[PDB]
Amino acid sequence: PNSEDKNFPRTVMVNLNISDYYNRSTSPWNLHRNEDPERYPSVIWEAKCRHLGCINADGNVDYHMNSVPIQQEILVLRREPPHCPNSFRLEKILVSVGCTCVTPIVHHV
Amino acid sequence: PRTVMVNLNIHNRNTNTNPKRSSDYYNRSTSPWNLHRNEDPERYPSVIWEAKCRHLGCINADGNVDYHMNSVPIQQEILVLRREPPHCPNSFRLEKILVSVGCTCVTPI
Amino acid sequence: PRTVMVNLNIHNRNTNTNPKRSSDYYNRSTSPWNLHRNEDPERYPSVIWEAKCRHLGCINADGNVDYHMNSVPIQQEILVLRREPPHCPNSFRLEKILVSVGCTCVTPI
Amino acid sequence: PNSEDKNFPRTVMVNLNISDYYNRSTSPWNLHRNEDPERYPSVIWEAKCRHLGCINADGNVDYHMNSVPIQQEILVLRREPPHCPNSFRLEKILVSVGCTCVTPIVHHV
Amino acid sequence: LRLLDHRALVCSQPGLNCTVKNSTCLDDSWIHPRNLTPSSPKDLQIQLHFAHTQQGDLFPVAHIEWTLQTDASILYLEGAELSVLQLNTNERLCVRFEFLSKLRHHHRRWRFTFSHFVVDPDQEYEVTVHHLPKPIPDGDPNHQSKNFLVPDCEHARMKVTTPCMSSGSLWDPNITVETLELRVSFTLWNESTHYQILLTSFPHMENHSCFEHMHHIPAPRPEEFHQRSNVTLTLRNLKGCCRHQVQIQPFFSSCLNDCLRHSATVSCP
Amino acid sequence: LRLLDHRALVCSQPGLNCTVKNSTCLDDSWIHPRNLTPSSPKDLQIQLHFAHTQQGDLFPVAHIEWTLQTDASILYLEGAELSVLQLNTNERLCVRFEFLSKLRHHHRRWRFTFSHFVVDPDQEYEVTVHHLPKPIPDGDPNHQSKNFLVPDCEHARMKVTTPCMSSGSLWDPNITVETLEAHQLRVSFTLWNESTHYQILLTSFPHMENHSCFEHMHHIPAPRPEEFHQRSNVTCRHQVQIQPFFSSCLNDCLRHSATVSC
Ligand SMILES: *[C@@H]1O[C@H](CO)[C@@H](O[C@@H]2O[C@H](CO)[C@@H](O)[C@H](O)[C@H]2NC(C)=O)[C@H](O)[C@H]1NC(C)=O
Ligand SMILES: *[C@@H]1O[C@H](CO)[C@@H](O)[C@H](O)[C@H]1NC(C)=O
Ligand SMILES: *[C@@H]1O[C@H](CO)[C@@H](O)[C@H](O)[C@H]1NC(C)=O
Ligand SMILES: *[C@@H]1O[C@H](CO)[C@@H](O)[C@H](O)[C@H]1NC(C)=O
Ligand SMILES: *[C@@H]1O[C@H](CO)[C@@H](O)[C@H](O)[C@H]1NC(C)=O
Ligand SMILES: *[C@@H]1O[C@H](CO)[C@@H](O)[C@H](O)[C@H]1NC(C)=O
Ligand SMILES: *[C@@H]1O[C@H](CO)[C@@H](O)[C@H](O)[C@H]1NC(C)=O
Ligand SMILES: *[C@@H]1O[C@H](CO)[C@@H](O)[C@H](O)[C@H]1NC(C)=O
């Protein structure tokens, strides 16, 4: 039931003016679907590392490296109240964007 | 659609902050990157810290840069809020920008 | 007297400033010096530019420092008007301070 | 005569909280006595360069170098109205403090 | 990012009434700008303090100090916004210092403190104080930001923090490798997570792997918590390949796979 | 230090009512501090310009341009004081910008320019803008300072200014040194239009030595007005230099030398 800017100080009218890396990487990650019809963007592909370690030249898993996720805090729109085609609410979520290969911190004795 | 309603009381869905699970991978990665600041007072968020790959290759087990594997940036399309100039029939505009959030090592075709 | 009245409409008796008669001698002098600024917000004049002799011996015709002659500053005692702390009965105080105006080459005793 | 503050904002109460260089210098100067009984300081020693050039080791005048005065603007007091030992007036006078020796600018053909 | 504890955060000092409030990092001034804006903060300093908690938990906090400029814009300084942003993950945590009185005098410098921002070991943050109201579009910054570097668990006061103890900072495996005709003995922590033994055989003085082997110690029971466990491994029969590196990787909950490993080396002679 | 002219100094821009005043570099705000003060200026910039007066004389001028900040302290800005401080001789020249109207609108950025300060060649000044009212004791600075170095007459454009021409920056001696028999040297040079004496200095250095074995001075009397530019002549390394004695540089002029080898 929101169509204009009433005396709500933080509800505003916004103009909605909107590949092989996961497979060739030394630390490959699967893209898992996260779908929400009440969210914009509706479908987000979250990265989950395909291995605990990384992949060396031979194609086997290298246990001396760490395949660790790179995540971000991003802004998404969630419908409020629900089923309102043109009413949204700002949200902050943490999504796993990538997987990188890091050298472990080693403590020698 | 063309214009929608957005409530800017940001709902933080990143509430799992009690588990401390993170580290700085921009130095320990086989494809390290420098963090660059992107400041825009006319945008929310006003400051975004992006990534630039340090090399074209990757650091192998010897600490030297191999040039048979490429350092590519992990890019994510993020939603940002921008304050339109006062000569527009809308005070705000939600925009999609491309942000490099990390770097990874990939195998050339 | 202990307390005297000062009319602060400083009479500019240095009237003959129209002729161009001087230049900077902190580089061409046999006893060159550096310029050090002395700033005191509570004092008038606030900024006084003093001389600090560059060497301990003068410069001969060859350009190499000769230590048989001494670079001595030319010191001057100048009246200064100082703003007094509010607990003092007189808001202003006239003092004498020593300033180094330039440096001259002298024969040692 | 004046002894107290008044609507005159710039006449204030002030607490009066009050050698061989000229002869051994390579650019010697004589001292001229300037005596004004109506001015504090009552006696000022102006510097007048003795020689057009500078003296050498032998004591003769070196015509290859310039004996140039170093002067400075200073603040002094003058009785206003005259003969009143309490009412004064800040005054700016340009006076010569010393003499230095400078190498001239020579333009070769 | 998190606040230390949800107690009443007090910012009031003699001569100034203020409240510390929750605030998303999108201020009302940014949405609706106002012409008269205060000056930027002066002398912003961030130190690393260590603060306890009712349950005896020691945590790292970012103590923030800043001062006011002496110009008249203090009459229009409606408060401050303190923000911490993580650089690797763009996470924002911000609070609002709302002044309930109009600061008018400038007798002695107004100094503001805040020590309720829990930080993580071995991390880099951007801590900013934004004077409120915010500047109009195309205006002077009116804010002060500084980078903060929280060191790793090796720092002495860092090591005894709750986050650092969680990742086994006070854990000494005491790895002993005894060669037989290889037995690796190590002490276990008090977490029920599996451990990884990586046995790599290099040549005498060559940086190459002529053998690699893996062993998986399952998660120990609570009865085996602070105990010594020994694993025997069979090695290859070659010559020159005599540098045996046994590296033990824990899988504590704080670091899933990217933990701190502990290594031992056996040489040829 | 001096101002270009006693003429009316235009200082009001559309939207502001300003006034230019003489300033004994002291200030009432310094004598009587005020609780609420404005902030420091922004983007101070001093350049070198050249100004022609109505009498046809061209002078170097320190062109000062600065701007304000967008903080609300603009509401307590009653003026500025522009000061030029000669570094060698501590001479000060101050001019007061007094703001008649109150500056309340920050719709457009404010820019202030002043281009009437006469500057001597080959000199170094400090140019400061102090926002009046001046700060209370133990307060923030609120003033801006910069150093302005002004080149000599060797600079291409500065060789034509009135100060540089008065000292003979355009002087062309047109020296001719001819070695006549019996070790004699005939030196001929031109005269500039000033009734002052000249110095000829002759030095006889050896072929390869940083010393001298013979020095000689000769004094050319002041030429008559009817001989303003007419040439004049006077009858192992021989170096002969002319030193002029102009009224601008009493004994520190630009000399002109000539050398003859063995
Ligand atoms: C901070 O708030 C307190 C409480 O409102 C203020 O204390 C009041 O001060 C006024 C004026 O002196 C008194 O008339 C009231 O009786 C006080 N009330 C209480 C409960 O003490 C205090 O003045 C405020 N401080 C500032 C700087 O505004
Ligand atoms: C902020 O919100 C949290 C959760 O709602 C609450 O526990 C805390 O007391 C709040 N703090 C303030 C200052 O409002
Ligand atoms: C480590 O083990 C060895 C032998 O197993 C023992 O001598 C040593 O004391 C142990 N270290 C500690 C700190 O207990
Ligand atoms: C593990 O041991 C440490 C001391 O070595 C102790 O502080 C900690 O509480 C223990 N953990 C548990 C879950 O009891
Ligand atoms: C480890 O050593 C102890 C004696 O130190 C022994 O009793 C135990 O059997 C050993 N572990 C295994 C798995 O054999
Ligand atoms: C400046 O003075 C004139 C005098 O008539 C007046 O009309 C004008 O409004 C003044 N400007 C401002 C900004 O007050
Ligand atoms: C300002 O000073 C100049 C130089 O002394 C003088 O000619 C002029 O009359 C003065 N103007 C005022 C208004 O005092
Ligand atoms: C002197 O002569 C020069 C030409 O060499 C001329 O430009 C200048 O105006 C003359 N000056 C006087 C005072 O006659």
Numbering used by the authors:
A (entry chain A), D (entry chain D): 34 to 51, 64 to 154
B (entry chain B), C (entry chain E): 42 to 150
E (entry chain C): 33 to 213, 217 to 304
F (entry chain F): 33 to 267, 277 to 303
Paper passage:
The IL-17 family of cytokines and receptors have central roles in host defence against infection and development of inflammatory diseases. The IL-17 family of cystine-knot cytokines consists of six members: IL-17A–F, which exhibit differential binding specificities to five receptors, IL-17RA–E. The most well-studied IL-17 cytokines, IL-17A and IL-17F, are produced by T helper 17 (TH17) cells and are elevated in the context of inflammation. IL-17E (also known as IL-25) is a key regulator of type 2 immune responses and driver of inflammatory diseases, such as allergic asthma, and requires both IL-17 receptor A (IL-17RA) and IL-17RB to elicit functional responses. Thus, IL-17RA serves as an organizing hub mediating IL-17 family signalling at the membrane by acting either as a direct receptor for IL-17 ligands or as a co-receptor.
We conducted cryo-EM studies of IL-17A–IL-17RA and IL-17A–IL-17RA–IL-17RC complexes. We co-expressed and co-purified complexes containing IL-17A, IL-17RA and IL-17RC. These molecules co-eluted in a monodisperse peak over gel filtration with IL-17A–IL-17RA having an apparent 1:1 stoichiometry, with IL-17RC being sub-stoichiometric on SDS–PAGE. Using single-particle cryo-EM, we determined from a 2.51 Å resolution 3D reconstruction that IL-17A–IL-17RA dimers interacted at the tips of the IL-17RA molecules. We also determined a 3D reconstruction for a minor population of classes containing the IL-17A–IL-17RA dimers with a single IL-17RC bound to IL-17A to a resolution of 3.01 Å; this structure contains a single copy of the complete IL-17RA–IL-17A–IL-17RC heterodimer. The tip-to-tip interface present in the IL-17A–IL-17RA and IL-17A–IL-17RA–IL-17RC structures superimposes with the IL-17RB–IL-17RA tip-to-tip interface in the IL-25–IL-17RB–IL-17RA ternary complex and the IL-17RB–IL-17RB tip-to-tip interface in the higher-order IL-25–IL-17RB complex, revealing a large conserved spacing between the IL-17RA–IL-17RA and IL-17RA–IL-17RB membrane-proximal domains, which has likely implications for the assembly of intracellular ACT1 molecules that can support downstream signalling. The tip-to-tip receptor architecture was present in our cryo-EM structures of an IL-17RA–IL-17RA dimer and another IL-17RA–IL-17RA tip-to-tip dimer with IL-17RC bound to one copy of IL-17A. The tip-to-tip interfaces of these IL-17A-containing structures are superimposable onto our arrayed IL-25–IL-17RB and IL-25–IL-17RB–IL-17RA ternary structures. On the basis of the ability of IL-25 to enhance IL-17RB binding to IL-17RA, we hypothesize that IL-17A binding stabilizes the membrane-distal tip of IL-17RA and enables IL-17RA–IL-17RA dimerization.
